[PDB]
Amino acid sequence: GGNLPDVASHYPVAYEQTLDGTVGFVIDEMTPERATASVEVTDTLRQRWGLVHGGAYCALAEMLASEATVAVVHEKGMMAVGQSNHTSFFRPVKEGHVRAEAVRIHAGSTTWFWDVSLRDDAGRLCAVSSMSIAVRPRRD
Amino acid sequence: GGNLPDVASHYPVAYEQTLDGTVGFVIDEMTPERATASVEVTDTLRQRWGLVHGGAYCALAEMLASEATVAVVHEKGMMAVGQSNHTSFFRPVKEGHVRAEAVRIHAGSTTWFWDVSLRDDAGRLCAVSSMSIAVRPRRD
Amino acid sequence: GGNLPDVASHYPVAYEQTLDGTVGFVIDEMTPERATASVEVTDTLRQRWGLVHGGAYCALAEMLASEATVAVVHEKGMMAVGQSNHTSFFRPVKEGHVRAEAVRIHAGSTTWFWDVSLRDDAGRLCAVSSMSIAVRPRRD
Amino acid sequence: GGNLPDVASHYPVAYEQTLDGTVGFVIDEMTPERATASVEVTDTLRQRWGLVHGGAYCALAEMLASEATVAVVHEKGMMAVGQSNHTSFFRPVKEGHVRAEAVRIHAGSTTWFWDVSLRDDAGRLCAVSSMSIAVRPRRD
Ligand SMILES: CC(C)(COP(=O)(O)OP(=O)(O)OC[C@H]1O[C@@H](n2cnc3c(N)ncnc32)[C@H](O)[C@@H]1OP(=O)(O)O)[C@@H](O)C(=O)NCCC(=O)NCCSCC(=O)c1ccc(O)cc1
Ligand SMILES: CC(C)(COP(=O)(O)OP(=O)(O)OC[C@H]1O[C@@H](n2cnc3c(N)ncnc32)[C@H](O)[C@@H]1OP(=O)(O)O)[C@@H](O)C(=O)NCCC(=O)NCCSCC(=O)c1ccc(O)cc1
Ligand SMILES: CC(C)(COP(=O)(O)OP(=O)(O)OC[C@H]1O[C@@H](n2cnc3c(N)ncnc32)[C@H](O)[C@@H]1OP(=O)(O)O)[C@@H](O)C(=O)NCCC(=O)NCCSCC(=O)c1ccc(O)cc1
Ligand SMILES: CC(C)(COP(=O)(O)OP(=O)(O)OC[C@H]1O[C@@H](n2cnc3c(N)ncnc32)[C@H](O)[C@@H]1OP(=O)(O)O)[C@@H](O)C(=O)NCCC(=O)NCCSCC(=O)c1ccc(O)cc1
């Protein structure tokens, strides 16, 4: 349901059961240099004070940047996992959607790096995340 | 609830409906300088490859560091929100628990900083998060 | 001098004696939303293995982001200081120049955020720095 | 003059000519899990406003964490370079010394991670740096 890249015939955990399926992350565009995703804000994404949870912006950035890397590297026999996620918070989001745009800025042999912007429905920049993704040969 | 600090009579979102209650975060210890929390790994905490989601370590650190700041500052008329969350991933977790310990290292008039360590059931350091928490006068 | 913003009649340390003047940082462009600076690589910018010091990219980003904030806020009675500097290193520099471009992405009442790109003489992205700048009322 | 680990018979750049020798960084203790260094504050370490430059704390952290890794890995045929440096600034330093303690918290096959604390002469925690060091086989 998430439109994550189809790079394998089966996956260990079905979309609807994962963190991402639970909060409702959906990938829209996906290219080697750029990917977008969004999510409808519901309480499941919020913390008790009624704001989108800082963790939700982190998770959306993490999935989008990792999977954008997976889309390219899996068929090359590689695995891609987050090694560093630095998200900074500029404006709270209370409702509507959060919309993430990941732009690739470095693609090394061992590390890819993506800048992710997280905007609210008015287009305001509410958070950014710098994602460093480790790329390593798959163990099996 | 998740045992979050009881600082107000009403909260906008019930624990069990927040991202925190959905994934199952529970605070164990809380003092002004040090707090701990933990979560059972379930699929809701995982991504589709079967590992604990990077976002889940970030969210655990974010709630713990923030709420451990709230516990001190709420009664002083202040709000505390995540301003920066830098989480780095050293070893994946596939199953069991993730346990977090937040140690406060700076308590400034406008910013508190917490180092958070995230450990598996074997005690191994799987991730760390450097949490910066903004502390502002509460709005009407 | 290094062409830093001229906002005060006296400064505690002369350009040529600061770390900035010692290594040779010079600001080229400065507007409220965007600033650029550059430095010639000399041994003073290098570490003992002959590469540009990681600290040198961090210092270039720090001075540029801070002073580009000073340029706006000093006349408003505010001081601006680095609060967080996250620099990530993609490709080393052995000789030539390092050129920095800071693009402002958030200008909040208490925090400004700048994305800084650090490029070699070939235009290649060698490092980036996410600069968070605290903005406070100036003390007597 | 810096007491950096002696792991090779010659180096590309002599200590006194490097950034580190110019500002005066000196390593005191050095073990596989922990290293310390300090530097006397002089104008060469300060910015124009008379404070220690944020870049100086970054550079001290960077050299100490990289070289602490070099001390162990060079004789194993590896190179160690900074891949990420995230320094956060809690209190300015105006004079005296800055004293850095690097503690190793993860030693992977490709990445080592060090927490560095930077204290003033009164022992106050003025800055911290999270250093991720890439370890790679040497090319020659
Ligand atoms: C960190 C890393 C090695 C990781 O690689 P990656 O993201 O997968 O990128 P990739 O491996 O594709 O390589 C990119 C470039 O890195 C360099 N590189 C990568 N691997 C190696 C290697 N094994 N040996 C030598 N150079 C390498 C190389 O220049 C490469 O370009 P190319 O020749 O392959 O086209 C690479 O991004 C890099 O070298 N970044 C720059 C590191 C840097 O310059 N840090 C600052 C200086 S070192 C730290 C320091 O300040 C210090 C100060 C004082 C002191 O006493 C000691 C150290
Ligand atoms: C960033 C911040 C202002 C945030 O404040 P916080 O976390 O709420 O801490 P708090 O406000 O409790 O204050 C801690 C100490 O900071 C200083 N401080 C805080 N607010 C102020 C203020 N409004 N005015 C003057 N000093 C202040 C002061 O020393 C304070 O101690 P105390 O005198 O109150 O006991 C404070 O942590 C701080 O001052 N940190 C250090 C910033 C720093 O030194 N950065 C590096 C140098 S500035 C950046 C730079 O490298 C640069 C280079 C070249 C160039 O041309 C320009 C800039
Ligand atoms: C961090 C900070 C307060 C810093 O302020 P700044 O960079 O100077 O920005 P500025 O003060 O100009 O304000 C920007 C917007 O922030 C909000 N804000 C700023 N100051 C305040 C304040 N004193 N009171 C209420 N809202 C404020 C407000 O929306 C403001 O817009 P406006 O209404 O003034 O137009 C502001 O950037 C901000 O609010 N960012 C978002 C913080 C955020 O949403 N973090 C994640 C959620 S809180 C952390 C968390 O996940 C958590 C999870 C579970 C749990 O149990 C507890 C916490
Ligand atoms: C990042 C890195 C691979 C780099 O390695 P390092 O710092 O040199 O550490 P090292 O290579 O020594 O290995 C440490 C452990 O990492 C794992 N690992 C390392 N290399 C590999 C590999 N090639 N294949 C599988 N596992 C590996 C392995 O568990 C290893 O332990 P051991 O079996 O070797 O004893 C390793 O630190 C690591 O795996 N860290 C954890 C990564 C992580 O769990 N990130 C979060 C989950 S993935 C990102 C994400 O959230 C996501 C969400 C949704 C979605 O749709 C996609 C992704």
Side-chain angles (χ1 to χ4, degrees), chain A residues 47 54 89-92, chain B residues 62 66-67 82 136-137 139, chain C residues 106 108-110:
Chain A
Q47 29 77 317
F89 303 104
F90 301 151
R91 169 181 300 281
Chain B
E62 184 88 33
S66 278
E67 286 293 354
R136 301 291 184 275
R139 283 189 180 177
Chain C
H106 174 65
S109 76
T110 63

Side-chain angles (χ1 to χ4, degrees), chain B residues 106 108-110, chain C residues 62 66-67 82 136-137 139, chain D residues 47 54 89-92:
Chain B
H106 174 65
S109 76
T110 63
Chain C
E62 184 88 33
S66 278
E67 286 293 354
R136 301 291 184 275
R139 283 189 180 177
Chain D
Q47 29 77 317
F89 303 104
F90 301 151
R91 169 181 300 281

Side-chain angles (χ1 to χ4, degrees), chain A residues 46-49 51-57 88-93 124 126-127, chain B residues 4-5 18-20 25 27 58-59 62-68 70 79-84 131-140, chain C residues 106-113 132-133 135-136:
Chain A
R46 296 186 173 95
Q47 29 77 317
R48 66 172 179 165
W49 301 99
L51 292 307
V52 175
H53 199 290
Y57 305 88
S88 310
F89 303 104
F90 301 151
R91 169 181 300 281
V93 167
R124 292 178 291 202
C126 293
Chain B
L4 271 61
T18 56
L19 174 51
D20 304 275
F25 292 164
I27 283 170
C58 290
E62 184 88 33
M63 184 270 280
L64 181 57
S66 278
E67 286 293 354
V70 168
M79 55 77 126
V81 296
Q83 185 161 209
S84 169
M131 289 303 309
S132 196
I133 307 297
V135 171
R136 301 291 184 275
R138 189 174 320 141
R139 283 189 180 177
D140 337 337
Chain C
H106 174 65
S109 76
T110 63
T111 305
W112 282 37
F113 204 102
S132 196
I133 307 297
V135 171
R136 301 291 184 275

Side-chain angles (χ1 to χ4, degrees), chain A residues 62 65-66 69-70 73 78-84 108-114 131-137, chain B residues 89, chain D residues 83 110-111 136:
Chain A
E62 183 89 19
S66 281
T69 307
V70 166
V73 307
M78 313 297 267
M79 141 266 245
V81 292
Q83 170 158 221
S84 170
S109 64
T110 63
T111 301
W112 284 30
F113 198 98
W114 295 79
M131 294 298 308
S132 195
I133 306 302
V135 171
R136 295 290 187 281
Chain B
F89 306 97
Chain D
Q83 170 158 221
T110 63
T111 301
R136 295 290 187 281

Side-chain angles (χ1 to χ4, degrees), chain D residues 51-126:
Chain D
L51 292 307
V52 175
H53 199 290
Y57 305 88
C58 298
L60 180 47
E62 183 89 19
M63 182 269 282
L64 178 60
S66 281
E67 293 286 2
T69 307
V70 166
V72 170
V73 307
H74 190 87
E75 84 177 336
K76 303 183 156 43
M78 313 297 267
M79 141 266 245
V81 292
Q83 170 158 221
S84 170
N85 179 325
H86 178 191
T87 299
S88 310
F89 303 104
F90 301 151
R91 169 181 300 281
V93 167
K94 187 151 165 94
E95 62 182 87
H97 299 68
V98 175
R99 281 186 298 157
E101 176 174 39
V103 175
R104 199 183 72 193
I105 70 172
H106 170 62
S109 64
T110 63
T111 301
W112 284 30
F113 198 98
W114 295 79
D115 283 341
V116 187
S117 292
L118 297 110
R119 299 181 177 275
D120 61 19
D121 275 354
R124 292 178 291 202
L125 183 59
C126 293

Side-chain angles (χ1 to χ4, degrees), chain A residues 4-5 20 27 59 62-67 70 79-84 131 133-140, chain B residues 46-49 51-57 88-94 124 126, chain D residues 106-112 136:
Chain A
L4 278 56
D20 310 273
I27 284 176
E62 183 89 19
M63 182 269 282
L64 178 60
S66 281
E67 293 286 2
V70 166
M79 141 266 245
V81 292
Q83 170 158 221
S84 170
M131 294 298 308
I133 306 302
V135 171
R136 295 290 187 281
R138 296 211 287 285
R139 297 192 145 177
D140 36 59
Chain B
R46 282 180 179 108
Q47 25 84 313
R48 64 176 179 161
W49 311 98
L51 304 183
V52 172
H53 204 287
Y57 305 86
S88 299
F89 306 97
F90 301 149
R91 169 185 299 287
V93 179
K94 298 122 130 51
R124 293 179 294 204
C126 290
Chain D
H106 170 62
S109 64
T110 63
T111 301
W112 284 30
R136 295 290 187 281

